Amino acid sequence: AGRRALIVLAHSERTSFNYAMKEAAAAALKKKGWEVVESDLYAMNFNPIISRKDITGKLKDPANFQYPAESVLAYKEGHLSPDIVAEQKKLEAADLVIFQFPLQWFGVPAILKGWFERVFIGEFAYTYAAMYDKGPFRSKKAVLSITTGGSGSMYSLQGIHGDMNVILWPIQSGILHFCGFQVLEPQLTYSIGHTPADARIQILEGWKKRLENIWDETPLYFAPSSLFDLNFQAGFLMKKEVQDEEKNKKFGLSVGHHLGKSIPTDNQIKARK
Amino acid sequence: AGRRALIVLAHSERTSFNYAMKEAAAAALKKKGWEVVESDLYAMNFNPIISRKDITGKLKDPANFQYPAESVLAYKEGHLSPDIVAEQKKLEAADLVIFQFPLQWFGVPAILKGWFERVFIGEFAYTYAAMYDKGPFRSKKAVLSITTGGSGSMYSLQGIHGDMNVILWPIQSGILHFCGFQVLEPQLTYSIGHTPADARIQILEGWKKRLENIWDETPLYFAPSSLFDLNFQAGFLMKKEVQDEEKNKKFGLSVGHHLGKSIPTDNQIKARK
Numbered sequence: 001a002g003r004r005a006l007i008v009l010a011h012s013e014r015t016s017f018n019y020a021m022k023e024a025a026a027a028a029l030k031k032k033g034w035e036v037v038e039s040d041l042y043a044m045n046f047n048p049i050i051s052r053k054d055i056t057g058k059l060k061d062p063a064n065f066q067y068p069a070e071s072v073l074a075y076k077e078g079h080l081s082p083d084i085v086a087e088q089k090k091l092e093a094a095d096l097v098i099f100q101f102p103l104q105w106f107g108v109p110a111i112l113k114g115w116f117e118r119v120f121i122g123e124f125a126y127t128y129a130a131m132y133d134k135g136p137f138r139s140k141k142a143v144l145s146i147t148t149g150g151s152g153s154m155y156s157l158q159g160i161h162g163d164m165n166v167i168l169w170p171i172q173s174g175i176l177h178f179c180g181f182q183v184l185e186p187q188l189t190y191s192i193g194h195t196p197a198d199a200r201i202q203i204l205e206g207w208k209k210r211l212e213n214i215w216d217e218t219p220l221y222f223a224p225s226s227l228f229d230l231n232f233q234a235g236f237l238m239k240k241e242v243q244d245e246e247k248n249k250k251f252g253l254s255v256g257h258h259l260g261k262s263i264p265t266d267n268q269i270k271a272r273k
Numbered sequence: 274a275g276r277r278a279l280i281v282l283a284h285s286e287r288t289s290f291n292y293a294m295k296e297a298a299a300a301a302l303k304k305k306g307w308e309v310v311e312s313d314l315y316a317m318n319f320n321p322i323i324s325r326k327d328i329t330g331k332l333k334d335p336a337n338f339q340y341p342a343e344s345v346l347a348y349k350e351g352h353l354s355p356d357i358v359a360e361q362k363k364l365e366a367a368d369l370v371i372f373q374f375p376l377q378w379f380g381v382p383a384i385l386k387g388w389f390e391r392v393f394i395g396e397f398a399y400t401y402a403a404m405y406d407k408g409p410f411r412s413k414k415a416v417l418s419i420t421t422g423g424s425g426s427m428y429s430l431q432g433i434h435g436d437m438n439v440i441l442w443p444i445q446s447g448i449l450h451f452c453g454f455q456v457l458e459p460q461l462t463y464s465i466g467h468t469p470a471d472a473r474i475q476i477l478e479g480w481k482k483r484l485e486n487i488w489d490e491t492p493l494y495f496a497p498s499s500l501f502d503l504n505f506q507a508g509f510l511m512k513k514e515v516q517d518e519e520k521n522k523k524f525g526l527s528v529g530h531h532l533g534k535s536i537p538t539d540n541q542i543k544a545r546k
């Protein structure tokens with residue numbers, strides 16, 4: 001299973017429900033014997049802005065700075081900024097990674113987005129030669145615990161905001177799975193600002209309850225890489241054999257791989273697929 | 274038509290293609306007689322982290338700080354920090370707003386995410402009473418000019434990254450359209466790191482000629498608010514008549530309002546509603 005957990009929190013107030021959720025998670029995991037490390041970005045006064053100062057040594061081409069290549073080279077030679085390296089060390093150590101944050105402008109808070117940009121460096125977090133399920137974090141599991149202002153109905157198929165599954169995709173598939181993470185069902189707590197005091201108590205208890213058997217959960221479904229032609233000249237498109245077999249299927253494979261068909265229900269919210 | 278434009282750029286290097294794109298757009302728009310103002314976030318030494326430091330007066334509740342409520346009060350009473358006030362003034366004046374940036378982890382750079390969070394304050398940028406269609410910026414138009422590392426095929430319905438339309442949804446509908454903006458087709462330039470010197474010159478020229486008639490363009494299609502019951506009681510769900518009349522249609526209304534059916538082709542990439 002997993003003995004180590006890393007909890008990344010993105011909220012400035014320790015009086016917030018998000019802070020309470022992080023505390024609940026840490027407590028529940030420690031009771032079950034987990035090793036729990038934290039990355040409270042606001043408390044760490046974490047720098048979320050990507051720049052050449054993320055590289056400590058001499059750049060290869062200082063007059064024409066390219067973040068991707070320079071950062072990769074710094075990773076391999078050992079000269080990434082030390083604050084970045086400390087986070088990478090936490091990730092390598094962790095089996096389970098929990099991201100706690102309030103939904104902000106239908107995405108991750110700026111400080112967490114900057115954490116991904118600075119910490120998920122090439123080679124370390126991903127490889128074009130081993131994308132998605134064969135990525136570096138393929139033996140790890142990630143989970144998003146989100147709080148929101150809008151009610152759950154606003155995010156249903158017929159709500160004004162639209163399907164929450166669409167909002168989740170860029171993060172869960174694009175950021176987490178691309179690196180190899182097995183992504184578990186998200187913990188969604190809607191309109192927390194309009195939730196009764198006693199209901200709020202249950203929310204915290206239900207979260208701690210779920211974490212007791214978190215590692216045994218079945219992850220969300222993403223189309224396996226074995227279905228794609230993993231080479232540049234082919235354009236990373238689905239292999240024809242697969243493409244044809246799918247032509248008689250009613251449903252697409254996932255949110256991003258809907259193929260023009262119907263997206264299976266709650267592909268990004270519920271496992272089993 | 275419009276005569277005032279605001280270009281928000283999110284890239285640290287003046288030697289980048291994004292910078293070139295911003296220079297191109299500014300040049301063309303001025304030629305056509307527009308008033309062009311710029312927000313080079315990196316050069317502005319812009320702080321993308323929301324906090325109580327965004328309010329200069331006294332908080333109504335210093336013990337339990339809640340950003341939404343406090344920032345709105347700050348806007349009403351005139352206590353927002355100097356940098357937020359200055360960007361709000363640029364936005365208030367602008368007819369067209371261009372967001373130029375490199376795609377980073379399937380979204381906008383952290384520094385630009387932070388810009389929306391600190392600038393797009395309630396009452397000023399949005400009201401729950403007048404969401405989407407009837408928002409404050411309903412008389413304005415916005416466009417995304419994005420550069421990527423991966424090729425277009427990777428972002429096709431059969432590409433390994435999945436459909437680009439799902440990636441654009443949370444930004445175009447969730448941030449821009451929510452405040453009332455009419456969103457024009459995104460300018461998408463894929464695999465800019467593998468494009469021949471000659472082709473790149475063509476991209477700059479193509480972008481410039483598009484900006485000459487940009488205002489007369491047909492905006493992207495988003496389901497109107499008239500199709501929903503805009504009240505907390507109704508949960509902001511789609512109207513009954515609407516739902517039933519929609520059950521006879523093959524395609525959903527948009528990426529977010531796919532209704533479990535097929536997503537209309539390039540809903541977030543091409544107009545024609």
Ligand SMILES: Cc1cc2nc3c(=O)[nH]c(=O)nc-3n(C[C@H](O)[C@H](O)[C@H](O)COP(=O)(O)OP(=O)(O)OC[C@H]3O[C@@H](n4cnc5c(N)ncnc54)[C@H](O)[C@@H]3O)c2cc1C
Nearest residue numbers: 016017018020102103104105106147148149150200340390
């Ligand atoms: C810039 C910005 C953009 C946003 N964009 C969006 C968006 O796109 N979509 C959207 O839906 N929402 C959006 N929101 C709203 C945001 O998602 C919610 O305000 C947030 O999730 C509310 O949770 P909270 O923990 O931050 O804080 P709080 O508002 O503090 O609420 C937690 C509640 O639980 C209580 N509480 C605290 N600790 C405990 C405890 N231990 N036990 C029991 N009760 C407790 C508190 O008193 C309070 O009533 C945005 C907010 C901001 C500031």
Ligand SMILES: Cc1cc2nc3c(=O)[nH]c(=O)nc-3n(C[C@H](O)[C@H](O)[C@H](O)COP(=O)(O)OP(=O)(O)OC[C@H]3O[C@@H](n4cnc5c(N)ncnc54)[C@H](O)[C@@H]3O)c2cc1C
Nearest residue numbers: 067117289290291293375376377378379420421422423473
């Ligand atoms: C943290 C991070 C996350 C990323 N996540 C993703 C992702 O999720 N998906 C993805 O697809 N990509 C991703 N990328 C890649 C990124 O999108 C590309 O590296 C970026 O879009 C390349 O454009 P550029 O303008 O930054 O710079 P450059 O790579 O410099 O390229 C511009 C090119 O045009 C040339 N040029 C410059 N000025 C001019 C001019 N005036 N005329 C003609 N030619 C000119 C340059 O010499 C260069 O070859 C990520 C990158 C980072 C750093």
Ligand SMILES: CC1=C(N2CC2)C(=O)C(CO)=C(N2CC2)C1=O
Nearest residue numbers: 105149150151154193341399401
């Ligand atoms: C979308 C959305 C918000 N984001 C900023 C725009 C928001 O702040 C709140 C309230 O915290 C919402 N709930 C009242 C319904 C909401 O739906």
Ligand SMILES: CC1=C(N2CC2)C(=O)C(CO)=C(N2CC2)C1=O
Nearest residue numbers: 068126128378421422423424466
């Ligand atoms: C997804 C993705 C990237 N983001 C950072 C993870 C990236 O940087 C590049 C670089 O140009 C890609 N292209 C090679 C195919 C890519 O596909």
